[PDB]
């Protein structure tokens, strides 16, 4: 696929596997809630999210920017605040996963900022080229 | 002379990872229960068991035969029956994990019988060796 998107998605996957998934006791966040185990969950939570889903989205290049990636990461926490309550142990774990994500993004800030820019510019460039043919 | 023990443990580990862990949406059975998330679990359950624990046991050659392995596998279902109840969906998943394990052991039954015998024979030749 396109080189800059491949590079941006490579970094996001390292943040999920290297940092977020390594949070202790984070495993209940690694896959979607089993509707059979938790029948209520899909009734209450309008937008389920988990780290496997984010990895598949990365692999499909859903995320062209840090902001779209963070929207899905933040939903993991919001869903736990809502379903499990804001002081619940599940929510403390979710907050740790969100916190390591933001900390790790800050570390790749320079590169990610540039890649984001490069992907935006290329899109408008392809539409401009198609106009000129 | 632990070649047969190593080969036996290799087969059990692959039953765990390729068969038992591959039962769908069975993640909760792949890790020990942590009392922080299910604070009442250990009021009820004496001897916890999970598939990551069984993998650790196999890596240390805990099991010299099917009987000791199956004690641990069957403990996973017995604990879900007790904690979640016999008709819980958690129990229904634990029963699929046990059934795919028995099914696979039955496929490999004659080879596992042979490895179990050779594990005992190696140990004996060594005990006779050591005894004198």
């Amino acid at each position: 696929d396109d080189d800059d998107q491949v590079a941006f998605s490579f970094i996001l996957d390292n943040i999920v596997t290297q940092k977020m998934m390594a949070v202790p006791d984070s495993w209940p966040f690694h896959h979607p809630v089993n509707k059979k185990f938790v029948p209520d969950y899909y009734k209450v939570i309008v937008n389920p999210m988990d780290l496997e889903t984010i990895r598949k989205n990365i692999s499909k290049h859903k995320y062209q920017s840090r902001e779209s990636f963070l929207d899905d990461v933040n939903l993991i926490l919001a869903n736990s605040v809502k379903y499990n309550g804001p002081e619940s142990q599940y929510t403390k774990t979710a907050q740790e996963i969100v916190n390591v994500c933001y900390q790790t993004l800050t570390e790749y800030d320079e590169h990610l900022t540039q890649l984001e820019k490069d992907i935006c510019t290329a899109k408008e460039a392809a539409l401009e080229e198609a106009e000129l043919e | 002379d632990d070649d047969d023990q190593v080969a036996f443990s290799f087969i059990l580990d692959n039953i765990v990872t390729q068969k038992m862990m591959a039962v769908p949406d069975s993640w909760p059975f792949h890790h020990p229960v942590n009392k922080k998330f299910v604070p009442d679990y250990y009021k009820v359950i004496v001897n916890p068991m999970d598939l990551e624990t069984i993998r650790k046991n196999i890596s240390k050659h805990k099991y010299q035969s099917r009987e000791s392995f199956l004690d641990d596998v069957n403990l996973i279902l017995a604990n879900s029956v007790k904690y979640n109840g016999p008709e819980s969906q958690y129990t229904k998943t634990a029963q699929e994990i046990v059934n795919v394990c028995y099914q696979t052991l039955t496929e490999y039954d004659e080879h596992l019988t042979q490895l179990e015998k050779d594990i005992c024979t190696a140990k004996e030749a060594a005990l006779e060796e050591a005894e004198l």
Binding site: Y41, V81, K82, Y83, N84, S88, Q89 | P39, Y41, Y90
Partner: peptide, 7 residues
Amino acid sequence: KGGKGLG
């Protein structure tokens, strides 16, 4: 199960 659904 356990603390799940407490909110």
